[PDB]
Design a protein around this ligand. Structure first.
Ligand SMILES: [K+]
Ligand SMILES: [Mg+2]
Ligand SMILES: [Mg+2]
Ligand SMILES: [Mg+2]
Ligand SMILES: [Mg+2]
Lengths: 139, 94, 201, 50, 173
RNA sequence: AAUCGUACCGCAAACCAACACAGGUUAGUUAUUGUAAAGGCUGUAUAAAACCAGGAUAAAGGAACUCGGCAAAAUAGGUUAUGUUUUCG
């Protein structure tokens, strides 16, 4: 079994394409796998839950192993300690999405700006050729 | 729509459309959709949607009013407009 | 690729304060011949901006900033214009354009200005003596000349120590805390791979 | 201050205050059930479901 | 004609504050250049006709100062390029009246009046506009009058490059 | 290793207020020097009455207003040699 899923339909992830379960509009971390339009029953199930936004460097994370070592011995403090650890894990899923959305926006803006520069260049080149023809025609 | 429907009815009966006159027109009450709308301080009011029936009767050579409307042509657009051929040299003379 | 004005005396600068166009006709003609003839002006000059309007502006600022770093004393705007043109060629046309570039540097603390001392506000307003500008080797967080920056830092350092101990005395943390937010996702990992390929190439 | 918000729903409160287990715990509650059986109400308690 | 009001400039209020009023008119002016024909309400059409004429005047100027003013009005680079290159040459000899307005009745829902705004010289024009330069008969009182009052009257379209510019180029080369 | 929750709304046109109600509703997180990344949202057609509401500007005078400086306006901030009162802070 792999640790992370690698085959995602990126049109679905960004939001241009509908999913395999259209009734769900905002998949949960454990619902992403079965809402993928490329879902297949032959692929082995990953051993951990990650969203499509997670980086490939998360495969070396072992969070529950570290939690046990930091476990307080007082049950009253232990219960609150565990509650804060679960809160940290859930928040990490939505830090990745925010970085994912901000990172893509910068790439899109750069590409859009580059296209704008090229279009103006072609228009100015075309006009210059027309201007030259006018002078040549008039001798 | 009622005027057109009535005229079609007259032709089927064998009347001349060029001599028809509107001789009777009246309305009649239909079935109403009742409702309620809230007001201030817990009071309430009515919210009703009304409906009506329309009846038109056309008869031949009935007494008619003399009203008649003047008719003009609309704006000329396309190849049928020739305002651009006007000669403006005449207005400079006496 | 600087372009000359229709008077063939200077280059046009990329900013909103430039009121002269760029001559672009295939043949050189005096202004008086074609300006009063009645022909369309767009056949002789380009009144618009270049496709690289923003990039050219950034390049010009670097040239001005580098030249100041090579200087050892504050100088006037006129000296800056002459020095840059001599080093690289005719690339700047007016002192007003250089002034606009300097204002951007002053705002972000990439440069500083030395102002004269006047007895009354009215004398300062009516004064016409040119100003002197310098450059910081690295960006700073305080305004003014190096002497003024040191004075401002001393006041800031005292304030920080005053605040930190007052917080401790009133049962607050001496230094504020936050949480570390993870800003590395799949998009960032692909950017790094792209960057290495560009560097290798 | 605006009035009319005397009801603040709570599922745990509703079961404990008016539930069937509560009605069967006292003699007066048992009499209330019999009164509702005599009148023939289809639902006996707010706690009832199929 | 377009009515003149008491506010600065004599423009319409278009039932909007001045800030939203200017944002709306700039967008519509950009679309008029792109498409050359638009259908809207009578008030927005009257304001757009007068605003559109003054935008063409800037394009005909063909100067650095004029382009700066227009660059704050037009919303798209492609539309701004067309204004100074294509439309500038189109209306070289036409003195005003680059836009026409024709009323087109009332709408269906709110029964508001509507009109059509279009450019006055092109392929696809609703009507055929009068020539930019009016021909003058050779034996008319009009010809004599213009000589006495305006010796520099223009009777036929002029070439892009006048003879003085052509002569200078020939002498140079 | 079984069992129950997992759709959708959640400062709201979906919850408490008879309503698509200018009211009420807990916790956890995010960009931003003088600003502010992501994300989210959007108004029948006009105008050159009286009058009403919420703003702006105003010659000369400056509480003459009024039960009453109501409302509005106003260099508002910091450091001071000296003096006064203290329960000495
Ligand atoms: K004009
Ligand atoms: Mg959900
Ligand atoms: Mg109520
Ligand atoms: Mg006054
Ligand atoms: Mg008094």
């Amino acid at each position: 079994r792999p640790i992370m899923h690698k085959n995602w339909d990126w049109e679905f992830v960004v939001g241009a394409k509908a999913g395999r379960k259209p009734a769900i509009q905002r998949p949960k971390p454990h619902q992403w796998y079965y809402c993928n339009p490329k879902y297949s029953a032959e692929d082995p199930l990953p051993t951990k839950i990650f969203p499509p936004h997670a980086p490939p460097t998360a495969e070396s994370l072992d969070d529950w192993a570290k939690f046990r070592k930091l476990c307080p011995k007082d049950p009253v403090e232990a219960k609150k300690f565990r509650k804060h650890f679960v809160r940290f894990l859930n928040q990490r899923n939505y830090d990745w999405r925010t970085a994912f959305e901000r990172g893509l926006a910068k790439e899109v803006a750069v590409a859009k700006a580059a296209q704008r520069a090229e279009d103006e260049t072609k228009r100015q080149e075309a006009w210059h050729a027309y201007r030259t023809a006018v002078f040549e025609s008039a001798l | 729509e009622g005027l057109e429907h009535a005229r079609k009815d007259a032709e089927e009966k064998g009347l001349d459309p060029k001599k028809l006159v509107v001789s009777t027109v009246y309305t009649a009450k239909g079935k109403y959709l009742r409702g309620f709308q809230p007001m201030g301080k817990g009071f309430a009011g009515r919210k009703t949607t009304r409906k009506t029936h329309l009846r038109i009767v056309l008869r031949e050579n009935a007494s008619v009013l003399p009203f008649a409307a003047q008719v003009v042509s609309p704006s000329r657009v396309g190849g049928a407009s020739q305002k651009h051929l006007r000669d403006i040299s005449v207005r400079y003379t006496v | 690729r600087p372009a000359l004005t229709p008077s063939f005396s200077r280059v046009s600068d990329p900013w909103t304060g430039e009121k002269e166009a760029k001559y672009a006709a295939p043949y050189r003609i005096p202004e008086e011949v074609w300006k009063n003839s009645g022909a369309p002006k767009i056949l002789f000059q380009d009144p618009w901006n270049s496709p690289d309007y923003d990039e050219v502006r950034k390049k010009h600022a670097v040239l001005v900033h580098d030249y100041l770093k090579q200087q050892s004393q504050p100088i006037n705007v006129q000296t800056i214009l002459e020095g840059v043109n001599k080093t690289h060629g005719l690339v700047l046309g007016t002192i007003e354009y250089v002034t606009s570039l300097l204002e951007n540097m002053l705002w972000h603390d990439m440069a500083y200005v030395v102002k004269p001392v006047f007895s009354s506000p009215r004398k300062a307003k009516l004064s016409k003596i040119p100003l002197l500008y310098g450059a910081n080797k690295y960006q700073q967080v305080f305004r003014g000349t190096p002497k003024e920056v040191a004075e401002r830092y001393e006041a800031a350092r005292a304030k920080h120590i005053k605040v930190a101990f007052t917080r401790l005395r009133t049962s607050k943390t001496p230094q504020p805390f936050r949480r570390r937010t993870d800003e590395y996702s799949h998009v960032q990992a692909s950017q790094s791979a792209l960057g290495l390929a560009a560097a290798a190439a | 201050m605006k009035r009319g918000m005397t009801y603040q729903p709570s599922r745990k409160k509703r079961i404990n205050k008016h539930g069937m287990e509560k009605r069967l715990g006292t003699e007066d509650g048992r009499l209330t059930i019999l009164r509702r059986l005599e009148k023939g109400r289809w639902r006996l308690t707010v706690d009832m479901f199929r | 004609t377009v009515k003149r009001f008491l506010r600065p400039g004599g423009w319409n209020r278009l039932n909007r504050p001045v800030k939203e009023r200017l944002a709306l008119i700039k967008n519509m002016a950009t679309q008029l250049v792109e498409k050359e024909r638009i259908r809207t309400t009578l008030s927005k059409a009257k304001n757009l006709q007068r605003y559109g004429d003054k935008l063409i005047t800037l394009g005909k100027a063909g100067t650095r100062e004029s382009w700066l003013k227009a660059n704050d009005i037009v919303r798209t680079d492609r539309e701004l390029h067309k204004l100074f290159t294509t439309l500038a040459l189109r209306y070289k000899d036409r003195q005003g009246g680059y836009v026409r307005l024709i009323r087109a009745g009332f709408r269906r829902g709110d029964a508001a009046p509507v009109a059509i705004v279009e450019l006055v010289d092109r392929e696809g024009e609703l009507r055929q506009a009068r020539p930019a330069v009016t021909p003058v008969p050779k034996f008319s009182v009009m010809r004599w009058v213009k000589q006495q009052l305006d010796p520099k009257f223009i009777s036929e379209p002029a070439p892009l490059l006048p003879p003085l510019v052509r002569d200078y180029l020939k002498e140079q080369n």
